[PDB]
Amino acid sequence: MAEKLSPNPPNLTKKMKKIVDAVIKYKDSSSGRQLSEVFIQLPSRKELPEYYELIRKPVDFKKIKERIRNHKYRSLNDLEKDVMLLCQNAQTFNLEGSLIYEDSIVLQSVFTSVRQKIEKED
């Protein structure tokens, strides 16, 4: 099947993984809820058919991680786009003010600050 992609510069792959790991690890300081936890693994098309009806380009953090390992992302812009899509998809499928919709909003901000921090190191 698929033809292997040229590996990214390793430093770029390490930056990608660092950023997504901080995002995934992030905790609401009050509840300790890992905001990411519901976004790790999207539910099956068999279990939640209506999801895949409204959301044409679904994405979870498992796929984002896969896409980093496979060098599908060629830049941090490419990674960011997919995390922002993850958050947009949440905001489309869930009603505003809901736990999942508002958590996705916070995760955008955590991505942005985490990215900045990591890029400011080099």
Author numbering: 1447 to 1568
Paper lines:
BRDs are evolutionarily conserved and present in diverse nuclear proteins comprising HATs (GCN5, PCAF), ATP-dependent chromatin-remodeling complexes (BAZ1B), helicases (SMARCA), methyltransferases (MLL, ASH1L), transcriptional coactivators (TRIM/TIF1, TAFs) transcriptional mediators (TAF1), nuclear-scaffolding proteins (PB1), and the BET family (Muller et al., 2011). The most notable structural difference within the BRD core fold is a hairpin insertion located between helix αZ and the ZA loop that is present in all family VIII members. The proximity to the Kac binding site suggests that this insert may play a role in recruitment of acetylated binding partners. Helix αZ is flanked by a diverse sequence region and a β hairpin insert present in all family VIII BRDs.
The 61 BRDs in the human genome cluster into eight families based on structure/sequence similarity. The four helices form a deep cavity that is extended by the two loop regions (ZA and BC loops), creating a largely hydrophobic Kac binding pocket.
